Scaffold this motif. Structure first.
Motif, short mmCIF file in Angstrom:
data_model
loop_
_atom_site.label_atom_id
_atom_site.label_comp_id
_atom_site.label_asym_id
_atom_site.label_seq_id
_atom_site.Cartn_x
_atom_site.Cartn_y
_atom_site.Cartn_z
N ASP A 49 63.70 -18.85 27.25
CA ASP A 49 65.00 -19.07 26.27
C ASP A 49 65.12 -19.76 27.93
N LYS A 50 64.29 -20.79 28.96
CA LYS A 50 64.48 -21.52 29.76
C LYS A 50 65.75 -21.95 29.64
N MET A 51 67.51 -22.28 29.83
CA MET A 51 67.90 -22.53 29.34
C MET A 51 68.95 -23.54 30.93
N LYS A 52 67.98 -25.05 30.98
CA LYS A 52 68.25 -25.64 31.98
C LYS A 52 69.34 -26.46 32.39
N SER A 53 70.46 -26.22 33.52
CA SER A 53 72.04 -26.73 33.51
C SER A 53 71.64 -28.11 34.20
N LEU A 54 72.69 -28.31 33.55
CA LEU A 54 73.14 -30.14 34.06
C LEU A 54 74.33 -30.42 35.06
N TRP A 55 74.27 -29.55 35.69
CA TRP A 55 75.50 -29.13 36.18
C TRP A 55 75.90 -30.98 37.33
N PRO A 56 74.59 -31.48 37.88
CA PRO A 56 74.68 -32.55 38.18
C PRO A 56 76.13 -33.65 37.41
N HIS A 57 75.99 -33.75 36.47
CA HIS A 57 77.10 -34.31 35.67
C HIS A 57 78.53 -34.14 36.33
N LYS A 58 78.50 -32.68 36.15
CA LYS A 58 79.61 -32.50 36.37
C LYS A 58 80.02 -32.73 37.45
N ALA A 59 79.34 -32.77 39.01
CA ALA A 59 79.37 -32.50 39.80
C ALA A 59 79.25 -33.64 40.68
N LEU A 60 79.42 -34.91 39.96
CA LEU A 60 79.28 -35.98 40.65
C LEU A 60 79.84 -36.58 41.63
N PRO A 61 81.63 -36.76 41.18
CA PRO A 61 82.30 -37.07 42.14
C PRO A 61 82.31 -36.55 43.21
N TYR A 62 82.61 -35.00 42.86
CA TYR A 62 82.40 -33.98 44.67
C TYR A 62 81.37 -34.50 45.30
N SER A 63 80.18 -34.37 45.17
CA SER A 63 79.02 -35.03 45.73
C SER A 63 79.43 -36.94 45.92
N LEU A 64 80.18 -37.50 45.28
CA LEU A 64 80.31 -38.86 46.48
C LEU A 64 81.44 -38.83 47.06
N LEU A 65 82.63 -37.72 46.64
CA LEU A 65 83.79 -37.99 47.90
C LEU A 65 82.63 -37.14 49.18
N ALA A 66 82.00 -35.61 49.21
CA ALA A 66 81.21 -34.74 50.59
C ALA A 66 80.17 -36.40 50.83
N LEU A 67 79.35 -37.22 50.14
CA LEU A 67 79.02 -37.87 50.98
C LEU A 67 79.62 -39.05 51.54
N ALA A 68 81.17 -39.11 51.52
CA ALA A 68 81.93 -40.48 52.21
C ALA A 68 82.40 -39.27 52.93
N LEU A 69 82.71 -38.38 53.04
CA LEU A 69 82.85 -37.74 54.39
C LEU A 69 82.44 -37.24 55.40
N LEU A 70 80.88 -37.22 54.68
CA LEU A 70 80.10 -37.00 55.68
C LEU A 70 79.67 -37.94 56.42
N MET A 71 79.60 -39.89 55.80
CA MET A 71 79.35 -40.58 56.59
C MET A 71 79.97 -40.84 57.49
N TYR A 72 81.15 -40.26 57.80
CA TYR A 72 82.37 -40.37 58.93
C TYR A 72 82.08 -39.73 60.31
N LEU A 73 81.20 -38.89 60.28
CA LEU A 73 81.18 -38.12 61.20
C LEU A 73 80.61 -38.12 62.67
N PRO A 74 79.72 -39.42 61.90
CA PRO A 74 79.16 -40.23 63.66
C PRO A 74 80.29 -41.41 63.97
N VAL A 75 81.27 -41.66 63.64
CA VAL A 75 82.83 -42.49 64.18
C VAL A 75 83.50 -41.61 65.12
#
Lengths: 358, 358, 358, 358, 358
Positions: C85-111
């Motif tokens: 009963d290997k219940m594989k999760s598909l959480w990236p589908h739910k997390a995609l906008p969160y990840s995009l916002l996090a990446l946008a915030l992360l790329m602003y640190l060196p600036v």
């Protein structure tokens, strides 16, 4: 829609110089904003699509089951033709807005290339040459006005044919720095290449658009009905129809109209870019007749020889567009009565001295 | 709607010159903004259409099946008449907003042509001529005021009939550069062609609009019901009606009203453009009586001969509109008491000297 | 959407200095705004998702029960595969906008790091060096113009080869403070580290993005159907289906397109940052030929030895970008005719004295 | 709604002149914005109509069939009365917003006519006359102040009754140009016709509104129920009701209220325009008593004879409204203590000399 | 949402002074705007919740009865566990936005306390001290330039070791008022307490947030299903289910993500405030070497003894941040070549006199 903001940010209309010709501006406008306008018209405003797909599900189905059927066929556009099992996809219908946005972004690259790789050097050259040229007014009327004042005091050879060499070949009538600057810039080939690249990129992108429309469109163009499959997975062990025939594409007319407009606009646009490219293939000598008498402007018309593909050609092309700013927007332009060297020797007996500011 | 933004960007109302006559501005406004207003009224605000088509499907059909029936007939407007099988299309109903936007874009081309091909040269000519004309004030009151001061000191022939030649034919009373400028500009025919093209394009577009309305409309004008077919494809092997009779076009009244308004507005507009064209067919000599006495303005009225189709006619037409700016908006306009050469010789014994600024 | 406001606030384009190179600005724009654009496109505008999940519930279910089934599977994305009963999760589908916002915030640190830890000191350095360099104009033309004026009065060794030491090694021809400033700042290594950190952070974040896409995506990439369970709790004692098979992910195409675009953009971006890093690995001596003759600019080219990783390299890099402001945007740039020491000794007989402002 | 934008663009409230009387502005406001306000109230804000028609279809009908019935009767408003078959139409209910917009556009024509055909000439006249009148201050106090200073030095006939002719009939006390200007513009009849046309157009449009309301309304005014037919075409061969009786007009109250308000507002407005027309039928001599003593203002009151329908009447009417700007907004207005020629001869012994600025 | 307006009003970025250190600004931004961003993300934009609760009501129930069931359980979150009758509440799910807004408001109190109780006095001290310090330039170069001019005229003890006391201990080289001001301000302890309170309040609020998350969350963290009761009142005498089992919390993932982000951000923020507190625990003597030679700056470095917790420490901390404004942004900063008293006595033989403005 994102089209409005995209048009607001990009494609939005030193300190006095004109660094872009009007035809280039028109081409850029009609090549960048046209896909944005098509995207805005196709997926907003007038035609509220709702759903781009309609399904004829069995009447036994519930509302949610019908919604499931029509939602799982939009993202799986595959015609399960009976002709083995060549499941033809209709993905351009789903990809059209992406393609329009991509084309709008692609058409903006040459503008950035020109703005980043050619504007500063051209601005420097224009500033220096204009500052050197604006000194030519008080060097033919404030320097050669003792030419007719002396002319009435003598007769012929030594008053108007032996003084045009002792005064024209004089220290105050010479521009040795500008002549060297022009001679050196005629040898250069750096800024002439950016022009050619900027035009060739637009030609290549138009060719790519033609290939895209001819390969992916024009095949699914009169197809408005396709039969899908739902029992292609975990639903295969269920009692319902194995082929949910007659899914209809509702927005086929918008597809066709957008394709035709995209073809027509770029077909109309093609020859303008070729004309812009060929503008640099000749030495423009329209007003060279009046240039060769003025002190500083004589050097501009002197260096018109050999291959016309140089930096001097581009500099002259951008100089004629700025020669009507406020100060050369004067006698130089008013010298339109001096275009009608035997007659030319005596025709200027009135105009040049009467063109004075006071 | 896109109509609001289109009206905001295009059709939105040097440094002092008037380069457009008021009637041309009115014509452009009522010819460009009228289709935009019709599009805004027809597909927004008051009449919320909802769906432009209604279908009488059988009561056995579900909600989704009825939606499928009414969604697949809007994009396939074809009347399956029983009279073989002449499937008449009703595509103008679907294409009306496209046509309105296309007409609004088409009517804007002459404006761009005029702004790009005729404004700069005309501006240059107007600037030069105005700068030359503004010097004519202190050349008839600051130069011919020793005409009445001497008049009281003598009697008749050698004080007011033998001095009007030794002073009028004098160096300070002559404008040799402006006379040559006007003589050369009368020969030109470049800026006169842009005017004719700008008007003829509007006439041609009005003719095209008439053809479009008379060929495609006026046929589907009283037709509000059509019978469609759904079993013309993958649904042909199904048990339901082979003619979904009585699809009704809900927005027929808007169609009729828009067509009638489009006809009426352009029918009203037609004679104004013809009047604008014929404005250039005559030499306007309304105020030539007062021009021929002033020093510089005498040249403007001297060169009125031969064919009136010249560049000088257009320049004069645009000059009379600017002759009331701030400085010629003076004695020149105030000289309305001098319009009532025997009497004319003595009538000006008060006005010209009394019109001085202090 | 929050993407519009995020792009408005961050990434929005002393008193004259340029503290950022154009390539760095382009990299920052295309690295920060790209995830925001992807987020705006994916979850707004064109593709109105509605619900990202569809469920095929039994027809016995009510509307509210079907809504319960489809609402309790979006927050519990678990594929109950029969393979224990290997219940594989598909959480990236739910997390995609969160990840995009996090990446946008992360790329602003060196600036922010560059703006806070390196801008003020570099600004002070640039201001001082520019103020010291602007004094070099009236020190080679207002000081060495009695070099050719004396040259015509004598012959050879003691007029142009024995005076270039009594005048060049003179008090008014020396800059002792600026030399010490440059010598001290060549030893420093503080502002050179912020550059390297700013580039290395972007490289590390790109590597992290690659790891995230390769580990979590690329596994659930062609999976669009999963079977869930509802009787996994208080509903286990109920008479309905224990495996609500065929929940379909509606937005799989957007998932795939966003992933591919994210891969492609950063793959294209990678070499530009490496080029920016390697810009500091060499001594740029393109125009050192013309620098070594000017009084103050000789010190800039004198100190080019040893390891090029210093503060002087960064200062020079930011100085060449500002050397074209308004006053050095002069003779210095116009000295392009002096790039063609035997010939060099005599070539400057014309240009330097003729480059004077009046 | 379009009413808000229409009120924003049109009807929105040289360089100092007042070219419109306050009553004309009030009339224009209440005649243009009133239909726009009625349109905004009737079809937005408070009364959300939804559908303007309700139908009592049989309970056997589906939801879509009922929608078809109620949608095909709004565009085909025809009462199929049993009284042959006089199918009375109720089109004003559908046309009311169109009529309101048309009336709002129609009432704006006289404003445009006045602004285009009369404003510039009147502005020129006002500017010239005001510039000539502002010179009248230092010509009765700076020129006739040696009248009382001499009065105390002598007695009676040759100090205050024999000097009012040697000084009043003097060169510096005469305005020969302004007198001729006024005499010439009294003969003109051009700008007086635009006033009459501007008022008569409003009267004619009010009459047209009355005719429209009395002919098309007032008949369908108490009618709220009509019986329609659906089987008048391709649906005639169907088993359902041949007269879908009792379609109800939901918005009858708004219809009645709008009609009554439209009647009342224009009935109230009618007499104001007649008063404006009759304003030009008399010579206004309210302050002629104080005008006839001042040097320049004597000419204004001298030319009040014959028919008052002239250009001078309009010029005076617009001049009294501007005579209180900043400089005539002085002693002229302060001369209110001189309105109470025996007594008049001696009453001014104080006021005129005491009204000086310092 | 209220988050956007809250961020707009509060947390929105004399006449030249900097009264806030950059790190304090960063801490305030990331401590105030973070809960607002979490609230905006959680209850808007991406995740359109709809209803935060779903119910599995019996199929016999109507639509309105199901709505009643799901509406009366959101406001009565009570798990009726069978384990007596410990009805555990799940109120944090309902209170999360309230708590986020309360935390955002709470984090703003120290900012107000600092702005109201410490800004004015600190501004006064900074203004006075800066005005006194800017007088120190023309007191070491305009007063001690007769130190090297005399140095070359003599030798050793009485020219550079016996004159540094007759000139340094002179009336024009003394600042008696500023010394007394600093001595009095070193004794004060008023403005140093506001700093400590401002940081301790943030620490206490972070501790309170930790307690809130650890006590109320972290218990209902993996619970997504609860069984409620409806027959707990006037509905108890009805025939339906006494335990409406399986109410599901739809937004559990948002709950978990918000909790984790809130923990992580403040855990990252904790050490920065401790560093800010410890900044005042030491005497900063980084550039005291160059301060002790300048006349006025000697007093600043003289008073560094005893306990560093004073008002002088805070004043110095805010003074170093303003010492680079425009006028001390000069030689003082340029004196970076004087950091390498035997050698120190002779090292300054070049820099101080060469650092003059002209």
């Amino acid at each position: 829609s994102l089209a409005h903001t995209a048009a607001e940010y990009m494609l939005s209309d030193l300190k006095g110089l004109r660094l872009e010709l009007p035809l280039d501006r028109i081409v850029k406008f009609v090549a960048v904003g046209s896909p944005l306008l098509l995207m805005s018209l196709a997926f907003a405003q007038e035609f509220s699509s709702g759903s781009p797909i309609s399904c004829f599900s069995p009447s036994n189905f519930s509302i949610r089951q019908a919604a499931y059927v029509d939602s799982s066929c939009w993202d799986s556009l595959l015609h399960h033709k009976q002709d083995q099992d060549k499941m033809k996809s209709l993905w351009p219908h789903k990809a059209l807005p992406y393609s329009l946005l991509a084309l709008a972004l692609l058409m903006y690259l040459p503008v950035l290339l020109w703005q980043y790789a050619a504007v500063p050097a051209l601005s420097s050259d224009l500033l220096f040459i204009i500052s050197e040229l604006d000194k030519s007014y008080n060097r033919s009327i404030r320097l050669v006005q003792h030419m007719l004042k002396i002319r009435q005091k003598s007769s012929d050879p030594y008053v108007f044919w032996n003084e045009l060499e002792k005064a024209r070949k004089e220290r105050y009538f010479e521009f040795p720095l500008l002549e060297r600057y022009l001679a050196c810039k005629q040898r250069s080939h750096s800024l002439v290449a950016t022009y050619l690249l900027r035009n060739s990129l637009l030609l290549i992108f138009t060719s790519a658009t033609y290939l895209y429309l001819g390969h992916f469109h024009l095949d699914v163009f009169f197809q408005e009905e396709f039969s899908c499959s739902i029992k292609t997975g975990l639903l295969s062990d269920e009692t319902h129809v194995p082929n949910l025939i007659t899914c209809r594409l509702t927005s086929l007319s918008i597809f066709q109209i957008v394709s035709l407009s995209s073809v027509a606009i770029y077909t109309i646009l093609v020859p303008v870019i070729i004309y812009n490219l060929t503008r640099l293939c000749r030495w423009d000598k329209r007003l060279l007749s009046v240039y060769e008498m003025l002190p500083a402007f004589d050097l501009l018309s002197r260096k018109m020889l050999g291959c016309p593909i140089n930096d001097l050609n581009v500099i002259l092309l951008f100089l004629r567009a700025n020669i009507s700013e406020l100060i050369s927007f004067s006698w130089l332009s008013v010298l339109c009565v001096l275009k009608d060297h035997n007659i030319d020797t005596v025709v200027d007996f009135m105009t040049l001295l009467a063109g004075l500011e006071p």
